[PDB]
Amino acid sequence: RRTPPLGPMPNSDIDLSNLERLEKYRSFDRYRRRAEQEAQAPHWWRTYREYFGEKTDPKEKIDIGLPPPKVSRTQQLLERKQAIQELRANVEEERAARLRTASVPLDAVRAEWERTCGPYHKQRLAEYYGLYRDLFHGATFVPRVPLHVAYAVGEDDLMPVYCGNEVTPTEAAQAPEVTYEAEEGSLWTLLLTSLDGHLLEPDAEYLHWLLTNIPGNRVAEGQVTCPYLPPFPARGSGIHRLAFLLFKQDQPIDFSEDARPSPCYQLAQRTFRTFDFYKKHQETMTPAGLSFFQCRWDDSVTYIFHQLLDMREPVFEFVRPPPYHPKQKRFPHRQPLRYLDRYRDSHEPTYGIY
Amino acid sequence: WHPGAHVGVGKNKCLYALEEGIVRYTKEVYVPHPRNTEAVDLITRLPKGAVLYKTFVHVVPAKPEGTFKLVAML
């Protein structure tokens, strides 16, 4: 039998009446280009994508956040044209490029990027690591405001804090220094949250470092409702991704349900849901800043288990399922003698009645 | 047919699954290695704008690798 094709079959736009006049794929590169483009394109037949690719809803992610400023595109492109003009008019760049001896200021490039095009890649990393799907259950935002944080190690050096950086518990044992250079004439709020730190249930987080009603970039004046306590990444648990969230408090708000006593190191006290937290508290404000990092188990984590948290330390482990073996049969055929070893429980010998 | 998604290949062109789960068939695009001179010359002589597809097998992993569980509370 035969059946008509449902959708437009491929290579149907082309005509076969003319073949020699048509130009061919001069390059594996061009064929690859077209191939992966059509692969990204959808199809009506069954495909790898609709089995092993993200099943995100077709609707765009809701984000009532900071819109971009009104930049004069005309003047901006004009100044960029002037910049490139004087750049090409420079004289040493010719020899530099044609001798392959040039470099670039990494600090300046980093600052300019995090100023201009950083926030989009930060959104990207956020919805990659899964911060938004776990916090807001799909909704998103853009951290327009830059954010620098540092854990000062001793007196001289410091560990930076940016999207996707390792942080040792010995260095995170104390409160870090923070900067977001935003006067705003209004208040700000910051909170450090661990998603996979909680153990009793899923979709539950802990809160380690909270500041509310921050008048300006100064941080010490910002009051704290949740005092400081480092995380406790247990041995065998793997890793814990902890995120700095920052919101633009338009006016001072109350904290009754959120008011917490001296730490008490109570997980039932620290646990909550960022989703309803934002829904109820943050209707006046919106996200402004975002960062994160990862943490792991350490000797300081052990110390705070045994002494600070005032509780026994847990010990988890990754364990795989048992290796599959089929049902036995009374008379195997053409199987080596270790067929019995594949099923025997005890490798030791045993004697029935003797 | 052709492999994909946790599917090895024997020297005699036999297809086998690498992990535990569900088999399925689909259609996808085919790009050879530059050493496969036959298919290379084929895709070069091919006329621009058209691309060939081929069948592929995919085993869907049912279970994850494992699970984190407590060993000792001390």
Binding site: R1, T3, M9, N11 | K27, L46, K54
Partner: peptide, 19 residues
């Protein structure tokens, strides 16, 4: 497969020159 609408998706000989 022949009966199904996806038949002939892989064929290329009519695209290339025959010789």
């Amino acid at each position: 497969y022949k009966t199904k609408p996806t038949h002939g998706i892989g064929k290329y000989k009519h695209l290339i020159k025959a010789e």
